[PDB]
């Protein structure tokens, strides 16, 4: 029965705030539909 420990930082831009909760039926289920986009950081190299 755990609460959610959320605290928006001070000096925050008004209107830009969203609280999301993600649930998965399997432990390794989240990295399935986002395989092309595991990370928002851009690509461009061989290791990337």
């Amino acid at each position: 029965e755990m609460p959610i420990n959320l605290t928006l930082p001070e000096n925050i831009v008004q209107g830009s705030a969203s609280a999301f909760v993600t649930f998965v039926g399997d432990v390794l289920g989240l990295p399935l539909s986002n395989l092309q986009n595991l990370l928002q950081m851009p690509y461009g190299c061989g290791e990337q």
Binding site: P3, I4, L6, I12, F20, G25, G44
Partner: protein, 144 residues
Amino acid sequence: HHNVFLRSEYGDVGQLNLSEHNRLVVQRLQLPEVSGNYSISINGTGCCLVQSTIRYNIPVPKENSAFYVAADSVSKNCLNGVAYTITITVSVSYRGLRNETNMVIIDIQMLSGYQADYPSLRQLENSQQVSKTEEQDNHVFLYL
């Protein structure tokens, strides 16, 4: 078997069920109040993951010592306010205690209604300072 449910001090937000069918699809929840006091619970037998994320924007927190960057720009054809052509120049330096730095990525967001100069980007490329350029979704990425 899993049944999960979220509560606030005013009511129950969500009541979801996880079973053999509901195993590979992700469940999305969005809190209507961003500063509330919520509590989740999962009941049943098995193993599950819970993720809680907060998304916001901050106004360029350049107040502490960090990987030093100083960005500015100049105009050349300034006319009646808005200038048709802009010239962006940035300065980068490293101030950490590490031995030596690795490859770095610089991202510049376009100033609202503008677009990249492809000849300028390719001139930067053929000059030997940036090994890769990229432009997409009004962000220009240079890989140093």
